[PDB]
Nucleic acid binder design. Structure first.
Length: 88
RNA sequence: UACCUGGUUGAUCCUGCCAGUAGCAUAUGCUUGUCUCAAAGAUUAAGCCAUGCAUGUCUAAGUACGCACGGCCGGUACAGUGAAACUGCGAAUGGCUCAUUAAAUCAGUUAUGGUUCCUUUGGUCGCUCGUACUUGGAUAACUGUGGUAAUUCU
RNA sequence: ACGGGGAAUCAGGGUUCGAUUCCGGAGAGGGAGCCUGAGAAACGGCUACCACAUCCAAGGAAGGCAGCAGGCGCGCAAAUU
RNA sequence: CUUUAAAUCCUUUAACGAGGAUCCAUUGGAGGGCAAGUCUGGUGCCAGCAGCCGCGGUAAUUCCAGCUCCAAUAGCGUAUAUUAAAGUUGCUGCAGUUAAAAAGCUCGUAGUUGGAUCU
RNA sequence: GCGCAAGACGGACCAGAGCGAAAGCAUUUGCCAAGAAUGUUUUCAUUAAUCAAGAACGAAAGUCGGAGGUUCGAAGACGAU
RNA sequence: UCGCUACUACCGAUUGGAUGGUUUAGUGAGGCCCUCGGAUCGGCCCCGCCGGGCCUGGCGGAGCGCUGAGAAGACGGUCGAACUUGACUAUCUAGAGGAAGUAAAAGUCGUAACAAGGUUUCCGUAGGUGAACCUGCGGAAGGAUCAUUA
């Protein structure tokens, strides 16, 4: 279900990676963004877990989403997965 | 050696702890003339490991036609030391570690009349009524031809 | 947390420690399955699979120090190829 | 020389080898616990000591140093586990009116405990 | 002042007095079952003491249903300081 | 109670980042055993060709005749390593969102408590308030009365 689920996910999740409070371009954790479903005091109705994707890890999702000229990736020394979006 | 002192209050007697005190082991700092002993990669990682060594073995008495020696006397079947290879035996002990393991291991205690036992010791070993003055084939060391980059390969 | 014989401390009673030279048990990186033999479910024997890691002419081949030394790592913490 | 597989060390022995900073003893202390200074100079609630109580805000018996002396001594300080001290885990042996503490009250199975009496 | 009604509560007597396992328990009268102490030259003959598990009761407030609402009265509302 | 500087643990939407230990269905490397199985290697005769005194040495060919040995490979079972599959579960870790506690600082705001603490204090409940706290009902003295007259 990567078609459907990555379409919904990356649609509403990139749109929630681009404006504000959707964060524009900053290094930030993808988790915080996945649990960020709210825009303008309502949920996006988008609730999805990344477990619904073809990526059994977030590192692989960051392997694909970084390959698309959308995000750039780095790993913090604490071990979180930190992404710096391409402003497109 | 059957032991206690300081700390609550303006002062007192308490309950009561904190702190002091003496060992004991592991670490550690400073210091170190003599001599006897002596633990020592256990704690964390039963984590990982170059290099070298740690299990081989023949008497008189299982098999010698390697000249490898010498060796004497030379038709003596084999004189004698003897590497190797076949055979026999050992390599299950020793050494190291403490991960597992809670009536499991272990200790004391009993049992095998419910079983196995190389070896050592002593017994037994013409008790069977039916080519032998000696039997059969093969294989190793050895000789030689070889292969593979590479082995205690073949 | 391997168990004992024991060790330190002790009036009398106890507490705590026992990996460690003696006895017994267990295991040879993790599990499993065997040959050989009087005696192994052996590891300085074998067969795998996992995890490591060596050589390679890329076809294949060899691995097991919780044996003595010694090296890395870990660490407050431990000796001579 | 001896020792020993071969050496080492010890023992045994010739030769040299002891008068001042040498052939020199150091580690912590010196308010109270706790043994031993109302010393001398520097610091002035700073730097710092101090296990605990405490010391330090211009005469510091407690800091930094010099002098003195005191404890063990070829040894003595730290940190940590642990034993005694601890009659502060109490079987020997503690406690529970007010200090920490007796259940709101009674019934009740196990558990624990049980009167005399038989030469 | 006369009558009527409703719901509460039993003054004084009431005490360092009584009764109950403890909470607690005071108007009269009857009914119902208990109970201690006392008395006993009655009977059974150790049936007993204390109690984990487990059970019975448990002031006030509080909570659900019902009835009832006089007094007092948290909440609330004023008036003052 | 607040409000400033730090402190910790504490829960907590989640994904991470690590792992670790288990269990279902589907498989199953290898051994050991079971019936097979028989590449090829031996003897026995079947004969010839030769030699020695029926016996005996060769050689050659066959007769799938007989028999003995027997490698690879395969069926089945078994022991069972380790895989795929989902379902599980305990740690660390970061943890967005919070909590609360503490430790300070003469900032507030008060004055609850200790005297009869200025309205006795405290207990259990229940409601209410910026904050201590206040008020109902029932209790205690740890009360401010060991006592009050027929």
């Amino acid at each position: 279900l990567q078609e459907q689920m990555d379409e919904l996910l990356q649609q509403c999740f990139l749109h929630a990676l681009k404006c504000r409070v959707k964060k524009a371009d900053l290094p930030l954790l993808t988790s915080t963004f996945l649990g960020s479903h709210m825009f303008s005091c309502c949920p996006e109705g988008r609730q999805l877990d990344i477990k619904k994707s073809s990526y059994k890890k977030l590192s692989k999702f960051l392997q694909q989403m970084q390959q698309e000229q959308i995000i750039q990736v780095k790993e913090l020394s604490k071990g979180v997965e930190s992404i710096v979006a391409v402003d497109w």
